Amino acid sequence: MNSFENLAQDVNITRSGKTLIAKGTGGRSSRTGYTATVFGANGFLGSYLTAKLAKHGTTVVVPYREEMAKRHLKVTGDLGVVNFLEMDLRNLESIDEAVRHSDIVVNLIGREYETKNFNYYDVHVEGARRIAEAVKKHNIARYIHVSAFNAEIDSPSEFNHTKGLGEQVTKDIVPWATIVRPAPMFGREDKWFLDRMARSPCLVSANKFQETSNPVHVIDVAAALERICFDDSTVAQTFELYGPQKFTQKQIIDMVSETLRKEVRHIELPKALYQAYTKATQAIWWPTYSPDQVERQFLSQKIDPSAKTFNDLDLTPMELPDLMFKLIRPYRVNTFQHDVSQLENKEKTFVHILD
Amino acid sequence: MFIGTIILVLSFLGFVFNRRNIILAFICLETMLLGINLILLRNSVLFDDISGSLFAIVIIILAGVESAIGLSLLVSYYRLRGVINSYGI
Amino acid sequence: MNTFIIFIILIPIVRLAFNAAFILVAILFLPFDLEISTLLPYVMSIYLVSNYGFTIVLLFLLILIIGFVYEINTNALKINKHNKPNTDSLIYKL
Amino acid sequence: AIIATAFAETVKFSGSKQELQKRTLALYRQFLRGAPTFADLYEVQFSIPTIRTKIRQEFERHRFVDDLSIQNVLYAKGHMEYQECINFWKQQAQFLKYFPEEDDIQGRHQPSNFVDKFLKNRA
Amino acid sequence: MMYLTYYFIEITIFLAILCTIFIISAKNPMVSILYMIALFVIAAMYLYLIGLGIFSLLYIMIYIGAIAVLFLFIITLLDINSTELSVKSNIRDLPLVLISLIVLTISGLMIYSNDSILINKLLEAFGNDYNTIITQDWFNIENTTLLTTIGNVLLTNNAFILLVLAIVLLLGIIGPISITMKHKE
Amino acid sequence: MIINIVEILIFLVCVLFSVAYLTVAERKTLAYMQRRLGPNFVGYYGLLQAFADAVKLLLKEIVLPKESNYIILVISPLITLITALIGWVVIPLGPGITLGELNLGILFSLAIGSLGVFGSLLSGWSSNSKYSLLGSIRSTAQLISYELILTSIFIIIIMFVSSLNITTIIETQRVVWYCIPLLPLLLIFFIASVAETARPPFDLTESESELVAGYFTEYSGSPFVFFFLAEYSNIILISAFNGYLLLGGYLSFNYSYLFNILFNDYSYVSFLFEGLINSSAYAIKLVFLMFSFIWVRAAFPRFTYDNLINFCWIILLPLLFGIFLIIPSTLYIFDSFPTLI
Numbered sequence A: 001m002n003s004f005e006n007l008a009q010d011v012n013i014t015r016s017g018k019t020l021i022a023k024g025t026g027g028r029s030s031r032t033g034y035t036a037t038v039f040g041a042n043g044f045l046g047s048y049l050t051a052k053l054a055k056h057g058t059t060v061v062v063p064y065r066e067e068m069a070k071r072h073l074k075v076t077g078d079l080g081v082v083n084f085l086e087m088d089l090r091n092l093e094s095i096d097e098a099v100r101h102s103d104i105v106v107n108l109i110g111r112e113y114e115t116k117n118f119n120y121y122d123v124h125v126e127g128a129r130r131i132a133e134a135v136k137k138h139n140i141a142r143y144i145h146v147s148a149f150n151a152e153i154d155s156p157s158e159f160n161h162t163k164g165l166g167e168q169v170t171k172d173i174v175p176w177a178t179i180v181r182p183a184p185m186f187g188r189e190d191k192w193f194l195d196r197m198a199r200s201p202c203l204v205s206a207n208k209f210q211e212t213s214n215p216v217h218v219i220d221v222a223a224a225l226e227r228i229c230f231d232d233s234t235v236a237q238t239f240e241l242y243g244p245q246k247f248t249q250k251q252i253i254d255m256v257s258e259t260l261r262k263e264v265r266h267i268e269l270p271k272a273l274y275q276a277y278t279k280a281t282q283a284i285w286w287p288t289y290s291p292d293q294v295e296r297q298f299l300s301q302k303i304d305p306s307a308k309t310f311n312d313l314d315l316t317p318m319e320l321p322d323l324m325f326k327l328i329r330p331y332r333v334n335t336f337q338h339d340v341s342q343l344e345n346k347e348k349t350f351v352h353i354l355d
Numbered sequence B: 001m002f003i004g005t006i007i008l009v010l011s012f013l014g015f016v017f018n019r020r021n022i023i024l025a026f027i028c029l030e031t032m033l034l035g036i037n038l039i040l041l042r043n044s045v046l047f048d049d050i051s052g053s054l055f056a057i058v059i060i061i062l063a064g065v066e067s068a069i070g071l072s073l074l075v076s077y078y079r080l081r082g083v084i085n086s087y088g089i
Numbered sequence C: 001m002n003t004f005i006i007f008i009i010l011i012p013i014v015r016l017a018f019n020a021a022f023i024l025v026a027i028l029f030l031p032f033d034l035e036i037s038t039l040l041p042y043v044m045s046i047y048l049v050s051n052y053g054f055t056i057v058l059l060f061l062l063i064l065i066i067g068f069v070y071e072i073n074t075n076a077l078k079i080n081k082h083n084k085p086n087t088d089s090l091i092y093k094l
Numbered sequence D: 001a002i003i004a005t006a007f008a009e010t011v012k013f014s015g016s017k018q019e020l021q022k023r024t025l026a027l028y029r030q031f032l033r034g035a036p037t038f039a040d041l042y043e044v045q046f047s048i049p050t051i052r053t054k055i056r057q058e059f060e061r062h063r064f065v066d067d068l069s070i071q072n073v074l075y076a077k078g079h080m081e082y083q084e085c086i087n088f089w090k091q092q093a094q095f096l097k098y099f100p101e102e103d104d105i106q107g108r109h110q111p112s113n114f115v116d117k118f119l120k121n122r123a
Numbered sequence E: 001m002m003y004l005t006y007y008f009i010e011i012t013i014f015l016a017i018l019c020t021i022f023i024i025s026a027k028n029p030m031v032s033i034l035y036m037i038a039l040f041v042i043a044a045m046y047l048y049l050i051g052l053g054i055f056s057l058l059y060i061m062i063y064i065g066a067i068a069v070l071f072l073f074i075i076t077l078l079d080i081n082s083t084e085l086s087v088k089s090n091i092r093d094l095p096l097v098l099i100s101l102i103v104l105t106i107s108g109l110m111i112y113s114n115d116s117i118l119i120n121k122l123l124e125a126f127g128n129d130y131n132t133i134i135t136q137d138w139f140n141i142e143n144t145t146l147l148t149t150i151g152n153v154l155l156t157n158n159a160f161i162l163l164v165l166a167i168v169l170l171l172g173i174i175g176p177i178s179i180t181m182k183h184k185e
Numbered sequence F: 001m002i003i004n005i006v007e008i009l010i011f012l013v014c015v016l017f018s019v020a021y022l023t024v025a026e027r028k029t030l031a032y033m034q035r036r037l038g039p040n041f042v043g044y045y046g047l048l049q050a051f052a053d054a055v056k057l058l059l060k061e062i063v064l065p066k067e068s069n070y071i072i073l074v075i076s077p078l079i080t081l082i083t084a085l086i087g088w089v090v091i092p093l094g095p096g097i098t099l100g101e102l103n104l105g106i107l108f109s110l111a112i113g114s115l116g117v118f119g120s121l122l123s124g125w126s127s128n129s130k131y132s133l134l135g136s137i138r139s140t141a142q143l144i145s146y147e148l149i150l151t152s153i154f155i156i157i158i159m160f161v162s163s164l165n166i167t168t169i170i171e172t173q174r175v176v177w178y179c180i181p182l183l184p185l186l187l188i189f190f191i192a193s194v195a196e197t198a199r200p201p202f203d204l205t206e207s208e209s210e211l212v213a214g215y216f217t218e219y220s221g222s223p224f225v226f227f228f229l230a231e232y233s234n235i236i237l238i239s240a241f242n243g244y245l246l247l248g249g250y251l252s253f254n255y256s257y258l259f260n261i262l263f264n265d266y267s268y269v270s271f272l273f274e275g276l277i278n279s280s281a282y283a284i285k286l287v288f289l290m291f292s293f294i295w296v297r298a299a300f301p302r303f304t305y306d307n308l309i310n311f312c313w314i315i316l317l318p319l320l321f322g323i324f325l326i327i328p329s330t331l332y333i334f335d336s337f338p339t340l341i
């Protein structure tokens, strides 16, 4: 039979005064009782999260803006489990609707770039404040913000500045808020890491490929958010999900090139020129690197040692050099067989040309 | 007179210094014949003569038949061996 | 700048086995193509070569028809099947 | 006549344990020699040694079976699976049915003592 | 405007050089055949430049249309292994490549002249300096072109070569059959 | 060189729009032969279906398989379109109303119909998988085997008129169209035309590969669109070769007595009404033969590669190398060898 691998018990009780009795063995038909809300399930991390939540029958409310990106989530659970709402941070009633009946809330909002309708401030600060005020009004028992690694309130990067302001506002309205701080995530169809090193015609670094970091598999961060949504010990806490092994950019690129058996192209042209070329590419409608991210190329990962980690959740986070084979074998060209010699004499026995 | 001599020389050199395969040898033969025909047709124009163009059309015929026979011979080699390796004839 | 000259630039810029009939068809396309292309000068000089070059091209075509005859009666282009239907007779020793 | 496929063995029930010993050993040998093919044909995310480990486990499963007819049945079923795998009939899912372990740890609480099973109503 | 079309022949010379180097350096031979097609096209261009478009078209419909179709028709069906251009394997030929290049070029250029002193035989080849006047006469009455002339001489004055090319083509039929087709029955 | 630009754009617009609506004409003609209708819902009687199939395919992803080439699958359809289009230059719609107006127009078309094969040749190399490289070989052997038969007809009729100028070949057909003395060549030329375009009943590879996982033209996006503007244009082009070789091209009823009766002078109206009449004869002929491509498609079943190569090299070629002997003899019997003009 199947199992409720996520739950430690069957009768759980939220901090809002709801009783949640589990039903079943933990398969597609089961129900965990819980009702959550994930504000970015359409994206890279939230997709894996809703998959792990709805595999066990947890009701999942998924706010969307594009109707067509989401459809790949309805597969993740039985009927009635995954529920969709059209929402926008510029409409408040939509946010109250999404969070009303929820025991858990999960904020994954945030672009790696600015737009015409949303600057970094409006999406990482004001959006967090709107959600927090609604999480507070309705007194939702749990709130699980995700704010980027290296976040610091004042910093050369505006992204990390906002991400730090989003932290303090959430925690200054919702005191029981949990905050996670993942490091650069990697996996299949990642944004800016392996699909780029494997597809992009040429890389560039305003520094050298020297920015140091601890990357991590995204499935494990999704496992972490699962092991935090249900553990009530994690209120008014902070996490640093970074990973065992420290990797410079050039190290990752060399492993990528080795596994791919193709020579990745890197250039290493200076800062102001790349910063200008990025600025001019922000006028075309599709996402591209933005002036504030080449700024983060000079900002290596400072880890906060006062915050919890994977080992506080009984997790064993994975290593990049093992997983790169699984993640890059599709782009492996595999030109041909090695050393065809000592095969002429064997081929000579077969009929190659029929008449 | 220039272009033909150049294609001819470079193709002879790539025929002689080919340590790789054989299709380059076939190609270099065809390019040598091309360069010959260009030399000859340039001279036939400058002299306003026809014997050059006659020998040119004859070269085209003979070169096509050459490639036909060569590519049957290769097919015989392949019949027996199954692989045309880089350094076999 | 002619309209042909304007057009002829604008348009572009805006493991296994085989049967030997598969290969013979290409290898034989060469000489028959060279025959039909060598026939062009005749059709464009047919008057000036009146009744002499006529007979010459006929002996040309007849010589080429000989090779076509050899090709047909060999049955080169035919595909040959190996898993034959049995046509022996059923005979029982008594 | 409807002829047999590639790696087909005719079903033949041996009358002795001493012959089936040999046939089983040949099957094990073929599985091991063919494991790299089982890694290439199926897009596998782990080692050839781990495949050989699982094969050894599957053969240790029925190591202590002394009834001859049941052994003949087991050998025939194993040759069926070798024919299914080496010819590219199985797809990835039906093959990785044999490798649950390699997939990521399913959650946190995997009960092993009584009290946890009781809290999860599995006792 | 005038001199925009002055150096087209030099351009074709440079391009033929490029395509030869590319035929020699390419990894997969299929690409080398494509570059051979580029070379036959450049030759057809040059022949149009010097006033023989008929041969340009005969080339495009013979070489490219048949021979190169066949070359791809072969390399598509055969397992022609290779050895990508390298430095450990082919560098050793550089001194001999260079000596052979210089000598063969200078000889192929000196050969075409009848002067007795050697250096002047090459300095005559490098004398491409003067323009050729073209006068207009009125003696040609018909619409005879190069193809008509070729038909006239090939079918009257040189009939024997035609009636021998028929036998060359009979070889082109009959040899490949004998080689490929096993007359076991 | 302004009007040269005007004349190019007119021609390109007319040809491409004719191709787009040949798709719709194929579908509606084939439908009414099948006792159904339509496309008749995407426009005012379906006159916008082709542009809808296009615009859908241009907003579609450009997806390239893992083990494939990119450049070959991209340029090869593009070069196919180009080569198929430049054959339109030598095609006359009036006496000298031609963009090219070359004296070697037949040989230009014949060399470009030889360049056409490379699309099918490079398709199989877009798939490093092994079976596609044999399926392309089947589809190349049909084309190079049938181009011998189309050419041979070009030469047979040029025995009647000793000039490679297309306009001159058409002007000799004032006396009689060359489809009357050489009627069987009309069937042969139309059969071989249908073959060279790989059209039914000669659609062996597209069907044989539609069953298999590959060996077909598994493209997507824009390359689809170019391949379907290069098939439906090679069709008109090969139909045009039939037109100006055998069916009189632009010729029609002598419009001498009419124009004499109605005009009195050579104005810029008579030139227009003349060019209208000529092009209309040329157009209705292309229409009847495009109808015939469709008519044939609706009826006949498919061939197999053995039946097809056997049809060519054992039935058609012997008849033609026979006709190569009967026609020069027929001219020599009667002292009627044509002159060079």
Ligand SMILES: NC(=O)C1=CN([C@@H]2O[C@H](COP(=O)(O)OP(=O)(O)OC[C@H]3O[C@@H](n4cnc5c(N)ncnc54)[C@H](OP(=O)(O)O)[C@@H]3O)[C@@H](O)[C@H]2O)C=CC1
Pocket (backbone or CB within 6 Å): A039, A040, A041, A042, A043, A044, A045, A046, A064, A065, A066, A069, A088, A089, A107, A108, A109, A110, A111, A112, A118, A123, A146, A147, A148, A149, A182, A183, A184, A185, A186, A191
């Ligand atoms: N992936 C990584 O490497 C790292 C991620 N993070 C953080 O973790 C989170 C992961 O997001 P990621 O996994 O990167 O994939 P995305 O960043 O693409 O997830 C973005 C989500 O936010 C939603 N969203 C963005 N802007 C708005 C907006 N203005 N209004 C409403 N919804 C919006 C998107 O909705 P739609 O898709 O419908 O537009 C999408 O669902 C982000 O908060 C990011 O800052 C931190 C460090 C590294």
